[PDB]
Design an enzyme around this catalytic site. Structure first.
Site: not given
Lengths: 179, 69, 106, 60
Positions: A10, A23, A25, A27
């Site tokens: 992001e 960040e 993720n 997943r």
């Protein structure tokens, strides 16, 4: 770090042309089909292939996108084939408020969605931005007639027609002033 | 003594064919484990041992707070 | 290819996953199962090539969430906050050691 | 937080985050910049302004 799966990096981008990482993720996200429909990449399937150790140049989802042979094993220089992919159309996802009910639309084959019990998301594909927004309008007008998305979708339906969305001139504070 | 565990543990023998050869540990069947398990009752390790799967007892806590040292 | 193991060889992978234990719930499992199975259907013309093992908490089942019935095998885990179910590694391990399983998707 | 708009030797202090908090409320204005026009869109509305009375040389 040696990542081995699907991931989302992001960033926040500024008008200067400067960008900043927020960040990672490690997943799947609920809204991942947006990419799947324009990239023709099955993301959970991609997550699965990576766990099996399949190299990127051997991933089916990727193979069509980079314009190569469907069955060759030749490694692909992803830098050298940066220009082959050009996105194919547009997707819009909208959060609308069993436990997960998939609401299929008869108005369009390229539009489908869901509402869950609590909250959900609807996804509308089109051949291009204009075509996808058009499909979304008819689907959301159709969606107000549906049950899980009636109160929640009215204030939401209003927000999508504003010129800012049409011109893709939005930001993190946009919706909060639209209502 | 913690009766609740006393009455549901099974024995993991060094040798079943001769008890006098010692036992390795006391344990719970997964069913037996799966009930006290929710409750912070003992510290165990899941284990496969002597072919069978056992829940190896590492410490006895005694669920009644206050009945210990 | 006949099975997930054969796919891995043709495309140069190194870990055979034929059974996935799902450490999750909701829409992810529904889109994911169809998405993996659709790609697997796309790849193998058989939606059950990858079998699924699930953990079942008391809370999610009464609503009859469609994703529950698709899985191939179930192990009841304690419900509630993540410290009691999907994240109970020992119970997962219990599931992992007992079956045993080869992969976890969270 | 604060940006000061200065009209020909004046100081009015506003603050931002693009959102601006001003007298009324928080509003959205959008900016298309040109070589010689200043082109502002405020919602579904567009207005265009000219850059034009003194002829200034640009170099020493």
């Amino acid at each position: 770090v040696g990542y081995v799966s699907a991931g989302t990096v992001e960033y926040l981008y500024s008008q200067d042309g400067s960008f900043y990482f927020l960040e990672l993720n490690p997943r799947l996200q609920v809204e991942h089909p947006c990419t799947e429909m324009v990239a023709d990449v099955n993301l959970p399937a991609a997550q699965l292939q990576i766990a099996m150790g399949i190299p990127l140049y051997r991933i089916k989802d990727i193979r069509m996108m980079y314009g190569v042979s469907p069955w060759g094993d030749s490694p692909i220089d992803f830098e050298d084939s940066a220009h082959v992919p050009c996105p194919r159309g547009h997707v819009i996802a909208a959060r609308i408020t069993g436990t997960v009910q998939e609401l299929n639309f008869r108005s369009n084959k390229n539009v489908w969605g869901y509402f869950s019990v609590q909250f959900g998301h609807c996804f509308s594909w089109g051949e291009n931005r204009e075509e996808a927004i058009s499909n979304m309008v008819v689907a959301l007008k159709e969606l107000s007639i549906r049950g899980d998305f009636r109160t929640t979708v009215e204030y939401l339906i209003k927000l999508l027609e504003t010129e800012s969305f049409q011109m893709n001139r939005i930001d993190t504070g946009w919706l909060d002033r639209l209502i | 003594l913690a009766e609740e565990i006393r009455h549901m543990f099974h024995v993991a023998w060094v040798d079943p064919e001769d008890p006098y050869k010692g036992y390795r540990y006391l344990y719970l069947t997964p069913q037996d484990y799966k009930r006290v398990s929710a409750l912070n009752s003992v510290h165990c390790e899941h284990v496969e041992d002597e072919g069978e799967s056992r829940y190896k007892i590492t410490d006895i806590i005694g669920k009644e707070e206050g009945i210990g040292p | 290819v006949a099975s997930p193991a054969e796919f891995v060889t043709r495309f140069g992978g190194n870990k055979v996953i034929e059974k996935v234990l799902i450490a999750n719930n909701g829409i992810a499992a529904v889109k994911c199962m169809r998405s993996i199975r659709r790609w697997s259907y796309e790849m193998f013309r058989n939606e059950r090539a990858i079998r699924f093992v699930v953990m079942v908490t008391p809370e999610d089942l009464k609503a009859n969430a469609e994703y529950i019935k698709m899985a191939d095998h179930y192990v009841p885990v304690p419900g509630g906050p993540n410290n009691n179910n999907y994240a109970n590694v020992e119970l997962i391990l219990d599931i992992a050691k007992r079956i045993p399983v080869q992969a976890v998707w969270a | 937080n604060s940006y000061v708009v200065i009209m020909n030797g004046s100081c009015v202090e506003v603050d931002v985050h693009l959102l601006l908090s001003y007298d009324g409320s928080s509003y959205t204005t959008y900016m298309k910049e040109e070589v010689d026009r200043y082109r502002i869109t405020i919602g579904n509305k567009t207005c265009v302004f000219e850059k034009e009375s003194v002829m200034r040389s640009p170099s020493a």
